Amino acid sequence: GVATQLLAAYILLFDEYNEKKASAQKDILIKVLDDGITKLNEAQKSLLVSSQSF
Amino acid sequence: IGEIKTETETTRFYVDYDDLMLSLLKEAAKKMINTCNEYQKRH
């Protein structure tokens, strides 16, 4: 839910090249992707342990 | 709860544009206000 709105904001605000919010945008993208990948990997491993439990 | 958390984190990352006049940020704040109003009205 957060990811899809952040990326839409990226497409909308950077249709063109604004140089001012260029540097902040890379930080935002790095932060959200480094969060989400960790989230997904932990969820998959938890689901695997839950599957093995039976 | 997670529905509110979504808009919360969304506005949190909308902070880091270093713009207090961003219409995206203002509108997301308007969204969160009405979200909190509808949650509190349920209680």
Swiss-Prot record, chain B:
Induction: During anaerobic growth. Weakly or not expressed in most strains. It is activated by SlyA, while it is silenced by H-NS. Its expression is also regulated by CRP and FNR.
Post-translational modification as stated in the protein's UniProt record: In outer membrane vesicles, the redox status prevents formation of the disulfide bond, leading to oligomerization and pore formation.
Impact when changing R12K: Strongly reduces cytotoxic activity
Compartments where found: Secreted; Periplasm; Host cell membrane
Complex formation: Monomer and oligomer. In periplasm, it is present as a monomer, while in outer membrane vesicles, it oligomerizes to form a pore structure that is active. The pore is formed by a dodecamer.
Protein's job: Toxin, which has some hemolytic activity towards mammalian cells. Acts by forming a pore-like structure upon contact with mammalian cells.
Entry similarity comment: Belongs to the hemolysin E family.
Name of the protein in its database record: Hemolysin E, chromosomal
Species assigned in the record: Escherichia coli (strain K12)
Lineage: Bacteria, Pseudomonadati, Pseudomonadota, Gammaproteobacteria, Enterobacterales
Full-sequence range covered: 250 to 292 of 303
